[PDB]
Structure formats: structure tokens, C-alpha cells
Design a protein around this ligand. Structure first.
Ligand SMILES: [Ca+2]
Ligand SMILES: [Ca+2]
Ligand SMILES: [Ca+2]
Ligand SMILES: [Ca+2]
Ligand SMILES: [Ca+2]
Length: 395
């Protein structure tokens, strides 16, 4: 029938009429990158490569969610609040006195199944919802709703309300943008994910850098997210997707993804990219989980993690998908605090960074170094600790 491809073009020379010429149908045109998602009869893909202004034609790959219910739970109750073990492990609670992440400029975007936006322990922190499914951007809530539970769970780990009920997130007051890039089954196309990343930048207004001041992540005038979190993976390294990642990085957004759960020598994509923080999983006894893909940047609680779940509910899940929000929360705490004290945010930084001058550099040196000294193939730099990190930030 047809297949979905993603074309990188020379925007000046590429004539879109040509794709319609070959029976192609345009799905979505990227704002931030020179690329377009198009459905073509596989008969035409060859024709596409040979067109002028077509630099590359890449295929629509797949990535998948990285968390699974620990006991095959369908979700359950917490009438009274409890603090999940990971939250303590990560030294979050001490921080709340300084900040809970409720500074206004700060948003955290989670690209995942969607969210249960009416969950009592979530709702007040849910700022914006979108779905990028099938290359259609929808802002209607019915589209936005979690049909899997993985995303609602990822989210509670980051933001869940500090209150009478349920559980509580690393950054319990931070603003959430739930960008749904995965289906009911937890499967996603690489193209929809790239669109999700773009949306996280564009923000609700649709305008990236509306002030045209060159500042986004950390500009109050702007609506951009300052932390994109992807508890998902796939094995493909595609050009266009990287490009979108660079776009986010360049906008100063901190990006975090799960290493993957295959006990692999190295992380899944996008975790594998240089500007993305790859997150490993540890357990309650501080062993690295056997499933956790190796060579992460850092690690965090990934085993038996209680969080929110749909229909106003809670559940325990496992995977590097679970580790990922913990890190994301830490960065949110860090940026929110830094921006509460000075009126800016820190640079994202690099993998080698070991200084207090970068968000990553801070994570790198405030982490609890385990196993072999220094960065290691199992723990990465170590286990992320919020309290130390913030201190480094404000120091
Ligand atoms: Ca923002
Ligand atoms: Ca709660
Ligand atoms: Ca701006
Ligand atoms: Ca501004
Ligand atoms: Ca180590």
C-alpha cells in the first residue's frame, strides 16, 4: 500500500509538488529541521532519492517503551501518601525546602504514552498535553490521554503531588508537558518522536523563540520546556532524528533517555547520542539491574518503582524507563533552583563535563560513584543525587 519515509531536503531547491507528482502524500513538515514526513508507494521511493533537493530518504523506524509492571499489576490504591524508595535514594526530599520545581519558566516534557491528566496526584502539575501520533499534532485531550499507563507512571515519578495521597515526585511542583508519542501498546515511530521533540520546543504557542531573542529554554517570555525525557528506545540511528535532537540541545534543553533493557553493551537510541543523557537502572540494594544496557552516563532507581497509574491509581514497574524520570527530576530541581536564585539556567553540558558549571557536569560529580572508581560501564558516573546537585548549583 504505502510506506512512511522522512525526507531531508534542501529547502530552497526541493519542490514539494514533485512528491505529489509521484503519488506521495505529505504528513507533516518540520519547522525546526529541513525535513518532511511523507507517505509513498514503495514503488516511488527510488524516484524520491533522485529528486533535486532530496538529500536523504530515511525510513520510519520503531522504538518502544522501557518499563513493565513488576508483578503484572493493573494498578491499585494508595489512600495515604508514601514516598517511593527511589525518591529517597535520589535525595530529593531534602531539596524541597529550597525548591520543589515550581518556578514558572520551567517545564518538563515527557514523551511517552500520554498521561492521565485527571489523576488527582498529577493534575495540578499538568500544564500542557499533546499527541503526535501518526504525524498529526493534536491538542484535543481525548487524543492526549494515556492508554497504556507507562506515561502516567513516568510522570508521577517526576512530578507527583506532595500531599495527602499517593506518591510524590522528584520535583513535586514542576510543570509538566505530556507529549504522547507512543500508542496504547507502547510502540512508537521514530518520526512521531521527532515531532514530539519539536513540539516540546515549539511549546503550546507554536512559537519557538517568539521574542526572537535567541533564548528559549529558560526564557520566561517563551513557553519552551527545559527538560525532555524519553523513557524509550529503538536500535536505529537515523539522521533526521539526530538533527531534531541537536535542535533541542541547541535550544538549551536538557535531554534524558533510558539506556535500554537488553543487557546490551551499549545504550539504545536516542540515549546513545552524545548530547543525550543515557540513564542506567539500579535496584534497592544498589546493584545495577542485569537488564540495564551498559555504558550509561548515569544511573538511578529502576526496579520495583511505585508511581501513578491511570484511572486514578498506582502501580509498580521496572525498567530503565523508570530510572529515567528520576534523573529528569533532578535536572528540573537543579534548573529551577538555579533560576530561582540567579535568573538564568545552566548550560546543558557534555558527557566529559566534570565541573559545576554545567547541568551534566554537576550530575557527573555529585553522583554516588559506585563499583569501580570513576565512570564505569555499569553505573555510568554514578547514582544521581538531588541534594548534592543543587548545592553544587548554587555554590
Ligand atoms: Ca520554559
Ligand atoms: Ca501525593
Ligand atoms: Ca526567546
Ligand atoms: Ca525573552
Ligand atoms: Ca564508578
Amino acid at each position: 500500500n504505502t510506506i512512511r519515509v522522512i525526507v531531508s531536503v534542501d529547502k530552497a531547491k526541493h519542490n514539494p509538488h514533485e512528491v505529489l507528482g509521484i503519488g506521495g502524500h505529505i504528513v507533516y513538515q518540520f519547522k525546526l529541521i529541513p525535513a518532511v514526513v511523507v507517505d509513498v508507494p514503495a514503488n516511488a521511493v527510488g524516484k524520491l532519492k533522485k529528486m533535486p533537493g532530496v538529500e536523504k530518504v530515511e525510513f520510519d523506524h520503531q522504538a518502544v517503551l522501557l518499563g513493565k509492571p513488576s508483578w503484572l499489576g493493573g494498578g491499585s490504591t494508595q489512600p495515604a501518601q508514601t514516598i517511593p524508595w527511589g525518591i529517597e535514594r535520589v535525595k530529593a526530599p531534602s531539596v524541597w525546602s529550597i525548591t520543589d520545581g515550581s518556578v514558572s519558566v520551567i517545564q518538563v516534557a515527557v514523551l511517552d504514552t500520554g498521561v492521565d491528566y485527571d489523576h488527582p496526584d498529577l493534575a495540578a502539575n499538568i500544564a500542557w498535553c499533546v499527541s503526535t501520533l501518526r504525524g498529526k499534532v493534536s491538542t484535543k485531550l481525548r487524543d492526549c490521554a494515556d492508554q497504556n499507563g507507562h506515561g502516567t507512571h513516568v510522570i508521577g515519578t517526576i512530578a507527583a503531588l506532595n500531599n495527602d495521597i499517593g506518591v510524590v515526585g522528584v520535583a513535586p511542583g514542576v510543570q509538566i508537558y505530556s507529549v504522547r508519542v507512543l500508542d496504547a501498546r507502547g510502540s512508537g515511530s521514530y518520526s512521531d518522536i521527532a515531532i514530539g521533540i519539536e513540539q516540546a520546543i515549539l511549546g503550546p504557542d507554536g512559537v519557538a523563540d517568539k521574542d526572537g531573542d535567541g533564548i528559549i529554554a529558560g526564557d520566561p517570555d517563551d513557553d519552551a520546556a527545559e527538560v525532555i525525557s524519553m523513557s524509550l528506545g529503538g536500535p536505529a540511528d537515523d539522521s533526521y532524528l539526530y538533527d531534531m535532537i541537536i535542535q533541542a540541545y541547541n535550544a538549551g534543553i536538557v535531554i534524558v533517555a533510558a539506556s535500554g533493557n537488553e543487557g546490551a553493551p551499549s545504550p539504545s537510541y536516542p540515549a546513545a547520542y552524545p548530547e543525550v543523557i543515557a540513564v542506567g537502572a539500579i535496584d534497592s540494594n544498589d546493584n545495577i539491574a542485569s537488564f540495564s544496557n551498559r555504558q550509561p552516563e548515569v544511573s538511578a532507581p529502576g526496579v520495583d518503582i511505585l508511581s501513578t497509574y491511570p484511572d486514578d491509581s498506582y502501580e509498580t514497574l521496572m525498567g530503565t524507563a523508570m530510572a529515567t524520570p528520576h534523573v529528569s527530576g533532578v535536572v528540573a530541581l537543579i534548573q529551577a533552583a538555579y533560576y530561582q536564585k540567579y535568573g538564568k539556567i545552566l548550560p546543558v553540558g557534555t558527557f566529559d563535563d566534570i565541573s559545576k558549571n554545567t547541568v551534566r557536569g554537576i550530575l557527573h560529580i555529585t553522583a554516588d560513584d559506585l563499583g569501580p572508581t570513576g565512570w564505569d560501564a555499569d553505573y555510568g558516573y554514578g547514582v544521581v543525587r538531588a541534594a548534592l546537585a543543587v548545592q553544587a548549583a548554587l555554590g
